[PDB]
Amino acid sequence: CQDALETAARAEGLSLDAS
Amino acid sequence: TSKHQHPVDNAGLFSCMTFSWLSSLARVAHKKGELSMEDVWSLSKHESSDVNCRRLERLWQEELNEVGPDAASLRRVVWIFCRTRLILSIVCLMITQLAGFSGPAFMVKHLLEYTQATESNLQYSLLLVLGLLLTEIVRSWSLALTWALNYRTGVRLRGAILTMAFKKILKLKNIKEKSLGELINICSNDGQRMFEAAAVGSLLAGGPVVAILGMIYNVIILGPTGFLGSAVFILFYPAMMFASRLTAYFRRKCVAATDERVQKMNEVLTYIKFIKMYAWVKAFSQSVQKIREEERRILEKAGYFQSITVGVAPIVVVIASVVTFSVHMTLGFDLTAAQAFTVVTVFNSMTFALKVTPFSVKSLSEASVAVDRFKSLFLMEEVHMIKNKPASPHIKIEMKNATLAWDSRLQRTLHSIDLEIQEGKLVGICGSVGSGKTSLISAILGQMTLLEGSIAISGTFAYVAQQAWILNATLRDNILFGKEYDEERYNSVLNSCCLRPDLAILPSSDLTEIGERGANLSGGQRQRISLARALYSDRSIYILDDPLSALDAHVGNHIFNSAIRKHLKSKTVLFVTHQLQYLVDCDEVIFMKEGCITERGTHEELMNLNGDYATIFNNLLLSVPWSVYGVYIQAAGGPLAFLVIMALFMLNVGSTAFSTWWLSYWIKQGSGNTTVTRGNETSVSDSMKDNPHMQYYASIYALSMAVMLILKAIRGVVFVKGTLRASSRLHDELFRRILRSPMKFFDTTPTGRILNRFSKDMDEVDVRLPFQAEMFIQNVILVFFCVGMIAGVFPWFLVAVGPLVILFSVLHIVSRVLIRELKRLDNITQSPFLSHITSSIQGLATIHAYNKGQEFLHRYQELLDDNQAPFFLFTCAMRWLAVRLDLISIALITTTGLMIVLMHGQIPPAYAGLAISYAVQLTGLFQFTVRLASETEARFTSVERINHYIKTLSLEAPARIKNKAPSPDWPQEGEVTFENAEMRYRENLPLVLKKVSFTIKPKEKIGIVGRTGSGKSSLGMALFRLVELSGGCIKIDGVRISDIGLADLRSKLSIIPQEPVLFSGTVRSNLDPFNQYTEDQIWDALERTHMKECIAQLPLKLESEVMENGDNFSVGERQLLCIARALLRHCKILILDEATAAMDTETDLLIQETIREAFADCTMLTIAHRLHTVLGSDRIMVLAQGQVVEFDTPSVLLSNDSSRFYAMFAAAENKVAVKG
Incomplete structure (x- = not known):
């Protein structure tokens, strides 16, 4: 699903939605 | 989309690494308050779909004709496509990593070892602060440049690969070989996978290198004891990988639990009328409660592991520091403030980079999968078009x-x-x-x-x-x-x-x-x-x-x-x-x-x-108000639960802060004024190993680490429990209000909206809101604790902080009015894109026959570019906000360093090291705070919708009427009387019952037949009190049903619906979900409806699984089961409503005779339109647009030519006889 490690690196400049 | 040249093309190095063109766009957005598609700039010529598609196709063709289409690597082609820009990005990322390492290590080491000196030099300390400032600026701006290059590389790759995919799709021979959803996902999501892969993997190849640099530097500073801090990260990050795997494992089972709950909720909402007229609300409520509690348990486990893996970076730093320094000092080594806090700062930098890395690995894995899918697509067989011309033009x-x-x-x-x-x-x-x-x-x-x-x-x-x-x-x-x-x-x-x-x-x-x-x-x-x-x-x-x-x-x-x-x-x-x-x-x-x-x-x-x-x-x-947050807090348990959760959050972060402060305190103590022998003379020696109480400090350090871990576990458990309690309260109240609202709600509101509130609003709150809320609160408390530590060392740090708080507020406002209006433009231009994709894939044969394979490709390219422009601006705005918040953080660190160097001789070196460590720790926490605030705002919009429905729904009649129970034997007979019956489904609608009055003697078989809309469908609704009367009264055996409780009214009436209603579960559940009858009664009913042989033959006769709508029996079997369920109740008056729907002849005769014989001693109200079936009954009732004109035995009606029932019988006979 959505992790707190993926979100921390993805909230650095990417959108917060994998889908 | 309107531009001559895109502003990214006319931007120098400074503008590229600071995004000032997007600053102009942000100014426009903030001034206007919203953005339109005309305020954004068109795609640059470099990121246009056609040129990138041509480049990618050429690169793929060279690979194909060098290696062949059985050993071709599309990964190689994508590499060669991105190569030079990826190399530039890796160079810039290496610069970023080098600066990020050099700042803490060299700058903080020299800054803290200057405070340990005895003489003050003001021209060297200021040079150190200048070096720190320049290093922070360099690392921030080099990371910005890396992101700027990666964004364009990913956009170009996405455009090229999607255009190539559609090009291939428009010329597929076996259109139905691949799926249609698969073909849609090829042109829709795989491009996003490639974009994220490019950007975030280009980030990836910079992560582990600064970790190695930090490990080597820690070894150089300390000795063999730097490996102790090194091994902590090695043991720790696989542990968080395992935690992620476990969270995913449990969320996979939660998917099945939620699917079961939503399926049952769909059953409840679709057949709510049947449940109401059968008084079956409690059974479905209990079933949904069981599914909900099992789903809640799975959610508890998943949330526990999630909270385990939430905020570990300060935890990593503290664990590594405790292990390193405890084993350093228990072996008799020596330690100073400079060494220890340089090591702590290096730990902080390592945690930053390793926070970046893992999602990069994940993105590259998804990229590999997407590239495999794309290669599978590009090697499919193409359709041709015959061109061999004939001999004669004729x-x-x-x-x-x-x-x-x-x-x-x-x-x-x-x-x-x-x-x-x-x-x-x-x-x-x-x-x-x-x-x-x-x-x-x-x-x-x-x-x-x-x-x-x-x-x-x-x-x-x-x-x-x-x-x-x-x-x-x-x-x-x-x-x-x-x-x-x-x-x-x-x-x-x-x-x-x-x-x-x-x-x-x-x-x-x-x-x-x-x-x-x-x-x-x-x-x-x-x-x-x-x-x-x-x-x-x-x-x-x-x-x-x-x-x-x-x-x-x-x-x-x-x-x-x-x-x-x-x-x-x-x-x-x-x-x-x-x-x-x-x-x-x-x-x-x-x-x-x-x-x-x-x-x-x-x-x-x-x-x-x-x-x-x-x-x-x-x-x-042949944007939500404070009311939504207050509602959620009240659902969670009120102010006390909020205070407890906040207290545990502060306890966790303050345990980390106390560990760091205890390190600083232990270093500050020194030797504690002990004179020791160092030769022929004795003198005081300032070394921490000469303190008689050193083991006491080391023990408290280890205790600090253990207490921090315990508090983290407690915080996670309590937060998960409280958030799930809030969500469960919301769900239970919504379900309770849904099961107790009149049929007017279910008639004026689609079941899709209510299911949406149950299906995805509940899922959204349940999983998403606790996660984002936890991340946001952890980040905010960490920021507050860092600022508080630096301020407890330096109050003029607060003096400088104030204006930076103002700047942060301004930045948040501007970057929230802009990033949200670019998000919407991103997905507004995606709807035409997806619509075109679906329309093209659903008509490939017609497109190919018309030779219109290039116009559709051109339209696809136009829509792709229209989507690509706002998406590019969106990502660049993310990095714009990141750059400005990094500037704020750099200002904070520079102020801390300036205070450290301006207070030389008045602040202990240990406290200065603590302050500089927290100032460095402040790096990167502001972007996360802003983004998480926005995310939690969206989740609370979802909560707003749920609470709107919770406090909106109206109320049905009470379950028991004060007028009291009618009788313990009511009804004694089957005499029902009507007089002046007025009935209307809703307000301002025409009345369906207009002064209708008749009497029915017990045991009479009354067949209600009439035209559509005559009111035939309202007799059952008014008899069951689903809609209250607007005039007149309904009387049974001298008892007026207007004064009897709904339960006592529906408990003695039965109804066979027009279509058979069968719920998921077992036959026992669909026949008697309250377990009130004996086995003998059930089997007698089943043999009465001719069902004993068909049921006992099954291996699980009374426990056999029943699928949705009972699609495991034939239609006749389903009707037989429904009549058996109705018969199990033993009701004196029953309503059978037109049970004929595409049925075979002998089955129809069997069911007709079965109903004739089963309800011989019960009054029958047959609502049917087939006149030939109603012949032979006692009386025929015909309704004329809400009024009755003829009501007598059919014998005296078919013998009269002027009778309307005779006229319609003759019309039906003509319709059957003439085909023609």
């Missing part, structure tokens, strides 16, 4: 003893085809199913392969498929199909296909938007529109495969005569049909039999030959 289609085969390997279906078609000859194709007509059509189109012979062809094709692909556009746009407009020709075409009734029915027919498959149109209208498109297209050859099958015979023949025998007498038409009565007027007839040509010629010759064509010929003749 010939338009010509084969010669050809034998063609399908492809699934070659599947032979055509053998020795000798076909010759001259211009102007209307040909018809005849045969049986599978004879090879569609095979011939596909071979002529170009989907088949040749084995022997030759195929000749000349001209262009129109195409009317058997499914009549309708284009997702206006009705006039999908009749032009890219052609120029002409008035008279369009009008003649429209009159030829009989579209005037269609033009009248539709509100804006000539301008109506039509769906991809057809939303407000019928099959015949679809055929007519496809035919109109074909005739307007004006091509040389027409392929009309069964164009008038679904169309009616009258209009079909009309169109045939008016157009095919009139318009296309001068063109070639390929008529394929199953109705062979149309070929009597055709010029040439073709019959196919088993793929071999047997007989053909003229109609009279076929009649004379008496062939198989003659045999079939004779056969056919």
Whole structure:
């Protein structure tokens, strides 16, 4: 699903939605 | 989209690494308050779809012709595509990592070892602060440049690969080999995978290197004890990987639990009327409660592991520091403030980089999967188009003893085809199913392969498929199909296909938007529109495969005569049909039999030959307010739960802070004024190993680490429990209000909205809101603790902080009015893109037959660019905000360093090291804070919707009426009386019951028959009090049902619905979900309805699994089960409502006689429209638009010619007798 490690690196400049 | 040159093209290095063009756009957005699609800039020429697609296609073609299409690597091609820009990004990322390491390590080491000196030099300390500032600026701006390069690289890759995918898709032979959702996901999501892969993997190849640098530096500073801090990260990060795996494992089971709950909720909402009239609310409530509690347990486990893996970076730093320094000092080594806090700062930098890395690994894995899918797509077999021209221009289609085969390997279906078609000859194709007509059509189109012979062809094709692909556009746009407009020709075409009734029915027919498959149109209208498109297209050859099958015979023949025998007498038409009565007027007839040509010629010759064509010929003749947050807090347990959760959050972060402060305190103590012998003389020695109480400090350090871990665990458990309690309270209250609202709610509101509140609003709150809330609160408390530590060391740090708080607020406002208005523009331009993708994939055969494979590609490219511009601006705005918040953080660190150097001799070096460590820790926490605040705001919008429904729903009648229980034997008989019955479903609607009065004696079989809307469907509704009366009274045996409780009213009445209602579970659940009867009664009922043999034969007779709607029994079995359920209640009065729906004759007789004999001693209210079935009953009741005119025995009504019931009986007899 959505992790707190993926979100921390993805909230650095990417959108917060994998889908 | 409006620009001459994109501002990224006219931007220097400074603007590229600071994004000042997006600063101008942000200014515009903030001033206006919103953004429109005209305020954004068009795609640059460099990121345009066509040029990138050409580059990618060339690179792929070189790979194909060097290695071959069995050992080709699309990963290699994507590499070569991105190579130079990825190399530049890696160089910039190496610069970022080097600066990020050099700042803390060298700068903080020298800064803290200057504070340990005895003499003050003011021209060296300021140089150190300048170096720190410059290093922070360099790392921030180099990371910005890395992101700027990666964004453009990913956008170009996405555009190129999506354009290539659509190019390939538009020329696929086996359209149905891949799925349709798969083909959509190829052109929709895989491009996003490639973009994220490019950017975030380009980030990836910079992560572990600074970790190695930090490990080496820690070893250099300390000794063999730096490996202790090194091993902590090694043991720690696989642990968080395992935690992620466990969280995913549990969330996979939560998916099944949620699916079960949503399926049961759909059952509850779809058949709520049946549940109400059966008083079955409690059973479904209990079932949903059971599913909800099991789902809640799975959610608890998943949330526990999630919280385990939430905020570990300060935890990593503290664990590494505690292990390193405890084992350092218990072995007799020495330690100073500079060494220890340089090591802590290096730990912080390592945690930063390793926070970056893992999602990069994940993104590259998803990229590998997507590249595998793309390579699978690009190697599929392409469709061709026959180009071998014939000899004579007079010939338009010509084969010669050809034998063609399908492809699934070659599947032979055509053998020795000798076909010759001259211009102007209307040909018809005849045969049986599978004879090879569609095979011939596909071979002529170009989907088949040749084995022997030759195929000749000349001209262009129109195409009317058997499914009549309708284009997702206006009705006039999908009749032009890219052609120029002409008035008279369009009008003649429209009159030829009989579209005037269609033009009248539709509100804006000539301008109506039509769906991809057809939303407000019928099959015949679809055929007519496809035919109109074909005739307007004006091509040389027409392929009309069964164009008038679904169309009616009258209009079909009309169109045939008016157009095919009139318009296309001068063109070639390929008529394929199953109705062979149309070929009597055709010029040439073709019959196919088993793929071999047997007989053909003229109609009279076929009649004379008496062939198989003659045999079939004779056969056919015969932003949320504070109110939402307050509501959520109140659901969570009120102010006390919020205070407890906040207290535990502060306890966790303060345990980390206390660990760091205790390190600083232990270093500050020193030796504690102990004189020791160092030779021939004794003197005081300031070394931490000479402190007699050093083991005490080390023990408290280890205790600090353990207490921090314990507090983290407690915080996680309590937060998960509280958030799930809030969500469960919301769900329970919503369900309770739903199960107790009148049918007016369920009638004026679609079940889709209510399920959406249950399906995805509940899922959203449950999983998403606790996660984002936890991350946000952890980050905010960490920021507050860092600021508080630096301020407890330096209050003028607060003095400097104030203005930076103002700047942070301004930045948040500006970057929230901009990033949200670019998010919306991103997905507004995606809807046309997805619609075009679906419409194209659903009509590939028609597109290929019309040779319109380039116009659709051009439209795809236009929509892709329109989507790509705002998405690029969105990502660049993310990095714009990141750069500015990094500037704020750099200001904070520079202020801390300046205070450290301006207070030399007045602050202990340990406290200065603590302050500088927290100042460095402040890096990167602001972007996370802003983004998480926005995310939690969205989740609370979801909570707002849920609470709106919770506090909106109205109330039904109370379960028990104060008027009291009627009797312990009511009803004693079956006498029901009506008088002045007034009834209306809603307000301002016409009354359906207008002064209706009748009496029914017990045991009478009364069949209510009438016209649609006469009020026949309201007798059951008014008898069950689903809608309250507006006048008059209903009386049973002298008892007025207006004064009896709903439970006591519905508990003694039974009803057999029009369609059988069967819920998921077991037969026992669908027959007696309260377990009130004995086995003997159930089996007697089953044998009464002739069901004992069919049930006992099953291995689990009374426990057998029942599927949704009972799609494991035949229709007769389902009706028998429903009558058995009704019979199990033993009710004196029952309502049977027209149980005939496409039923076989003997089953109908069996069910009719079963109902006749089963309810012999019960009053029967048969609501049916089939007059022949109601004959033989006691009295016939006919309703006339809410009023009764005739009510007596059928014998005295059929004997009177003036009787209306006799008139409708005669009409029904004429309808049955005349077919004709």
